[model samples]
Target: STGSATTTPIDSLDDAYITPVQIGTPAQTLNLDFDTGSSDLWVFSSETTASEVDGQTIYTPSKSTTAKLLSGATWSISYGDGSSSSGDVYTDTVSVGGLTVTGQAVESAKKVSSSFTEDSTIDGLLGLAFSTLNTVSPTQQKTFFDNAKASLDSPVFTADLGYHAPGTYNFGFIDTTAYTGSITYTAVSTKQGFWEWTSTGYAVGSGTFKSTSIDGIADTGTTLLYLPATVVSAYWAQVSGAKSSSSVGGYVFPCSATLPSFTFGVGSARIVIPGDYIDFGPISTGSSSCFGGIQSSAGIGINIFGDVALKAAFVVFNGATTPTLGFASK
Candidate 1:
């Protein structure tokens, strides 16, 4: 069966959704955040020295008969948020839901950064991006999707995110009942091995959709929505007492601020982000000053349609010659 898996929402982080994946022969179950932003299936494993290990559950390859150390190969990966991990490579059967990819590159960590180690709930990451983005040394590896797609019912996957709630990720088949209205398909340009695309324009609150263009990625691993600086500035102007906060390390606003809805053009269908969803809860140890979920992608050229933006509707990540994205209101 070309199966799919439902992900578990991070109860505390409410950021990246975690999915249960099995590794090795006996199938050690690990909850990993499925990231479309980067390509590398890495896990905190027995290779990690004790000093580097924390509360994470480790994958011990020695116990799995099918596991094999890829000689002289190593891998290291870093995220846009500065979190990082490094490790050796192992080829094993990695299973998600009922589908299993044999000889998948399972990177087992030898070291991890504080940000990753501190994320006690997440064991590692399962990359859903293109195989070209894999970071293994001496040789690259195909993503699980790339390996499993050939045997699937269809060459497609869907990302359905919910506000502070668990969502479903389906592979090989699109569930007709998941979305409302007709799906608006947009062409994707994947030069950088990302699900990158362009939005015709955007608007703050209920403002008219401008004719401007914004280039960005649909990254489920990212927690917040980042737009162009000018667009962000426009968004903040509509929120009372909202401003960039150095102490909070992002745009902050009054906890009681009334935020307006945000919309981005998607072909003929526009994705409207609810104002309340933009309030990504409060910042660290602050009741008055809260962090704004929608921030400026100033330094970075591409914006991020993260959880905050994705949860607003049903999204289709169709990997095809055209690689179109379909959006419909939820």
Candidate 2:
């Protein structure tokens, strides 16, 4: 049966920085961020200007006893959300969690935008999602997954993102202990890396909003789950006098009583977004009403299952073996 599963929350870095990962056989460590939103791994370099590379960690080859730089190939990437970065290409050995993969392709960004440069803790983003959005061409070929796929047993990878506790990003094998039953493998849509899914309907409190289903993707890149407006409104309607407020970024309701339980139906799976996720602040606008999880993102993309939803389920990405996604009880 489809149900929600609980896992330990991984602690978020206070400085927002992750340890440098060692790549290649000899193992060279490069500080990087584990980003689920994108599918690439890159770092800043010494060649970057003070402004271009400010507040970002720069990975200098000279500092590391073991490191290699690519010849002349340089890369620049722009995201849908107006975030961009540029850097030269390089290959080196990277290691994480005592696991080492050799000859891995990496991007050393000489210039980065303020979004990345401003974050002192976040040095670089390590794309652990999928290979579809990979900038590395098949001919020039290089990616964290591409290099490590050969060594992994299942040729599949699962991420256990722990924001509250010391989180772990494990590759290669799926912990059967985390799964309650057999895994339900879903065929990936012939589109992109985004996990686009079809839903039947939605529910909030005890009310079921029929024929109010939507089609969209699940992205780890985003922090909140963006849903359709009508669905959002219907969800709030269920909450007792849950009026939408603009002060707290809309969808702010009184916190007098316990918030309602909401669930989104994905095929047979009923993904529940707890009431606590909806309640955000101590004071609710004028009174003591708390904020709800269902926020207003009218112009933003369709429903996106961010980290909140990901934590409720067991998700798997298969890039090397089948290029599919597997979901099971967590």
Candidate 3:
């Protein structure tokens, strides 16, 4: 029992990654964001108000013969970025890649926030994080990974994120050919409903390593890499004209600035993020100032190793008796 799904970036900035999912009988395919930061398999659906419907494909449970409404079941979720969606629940046969899970909880959105309505690329979210974070009330539901893990060849899943290219998420077994070099395994803490871990330290370009412990979460749902204020300032300081801006939002630099690479320690292994990956796209069309892929996590309270960092390596989310994380170079 193994499966694989291709994830494609939505925008030039790689704002989000979306994967196609088949739901219900006769299968209605919808693009869903595979978010590891939160645990709620929600979607824009026919239950959603017409005003909130943008270009997103809607999941109409009524159209599926296998769809069964979970009587009185309701769910609501809010993301770190403040985007939110809430709705009723339905059980249906859902399939991703070649993996199938019958009676998978599919949250149907009845209401959505403005941010969700504007992003037409993602029709919904398929949460891969621990099910403890599920937002369903009365009876919490298991995430797709949680429900499918037992049937997989191994109770594990892997994320191979690509920079401006198609990546993949594999379940049940690790694809040996997908990565190079030996994997560095690290302990994971799932108590907080996140794939949280501690990074050994960091370095800027060829600078000396800073031996400090940084606690962060592997969050594919987020777009940027967020670290401590001190670490973020250190990285930006190396750039000639980089500065934190309130108007433009976050740290920005001259598009022409010579950027330095960022390196982080995963146990004894070092993962280097190329300088170009840090140079996020311009703040606006034709703007000379470019937003950074790395930002300060002071406001977030928790550091996030998001798409920017995840793209640098192959990440394994092992759900064995004791959860562990594996990082390997490509």
Which numbered prediction scores highest in lDDT against the true structure?
A: 3
Provide the TM-score for each candidate, comma-separated: 0.96, 0.78, 0.99
Per-residue lDDT tens digits of candidate 1, residues 1-330?
Answer: 466778777864466788889999999999999888888999988888788777889999999999999999999898888778898999999998888889999999999998887778899998988888899999998998888877878888888887767778888888889888888888888789998988888888778778787889989899889998889998899887899987767799988888899998887678888888887667866577778889999876789998888889888888876787878888
In the range 1-330, model 3's lDDT, one tens digit per residue, is 998999999987788999999999989999999999999999999989999999999999999999999998999998899889999999999998999999999999999999999999999999988999999999999999999988999999999988989999999999999999998999999889999999999999999999999999999999999999999999999999999999987999999987999999999899999998898878998999999999999998999999999999999999999999999999
Worst lDDT run of 10 residues, candidate 1, spans 7-16
Model 2, range 8-31, lDDT digits (tens) per residue? 332331223254565544444555
Once fitted onto the true fold, the runs of candidate 2 whose alpha carbons sit more than 4 angstroms away are: 1-20, 23-31, 52-56, 136-141, 209-213, 239-250, 253-258, 280-292, 296-298
Best TM-score among the predictions, by candidate number:
3
- Tell me the deviation in Å of residue 228 in model 2: 1.8
| Runs of candidate 1 exceeding 4 Å displacement | none
Q: Sort every candidate by TM-score, greatest first.
A: 3, 1, 2
Q: What order do you get sorting by lDDT, best first?
A: 3, 1, 2
Specify the poorest-scoring 10-residue window by lDDT in model 2: 1-10
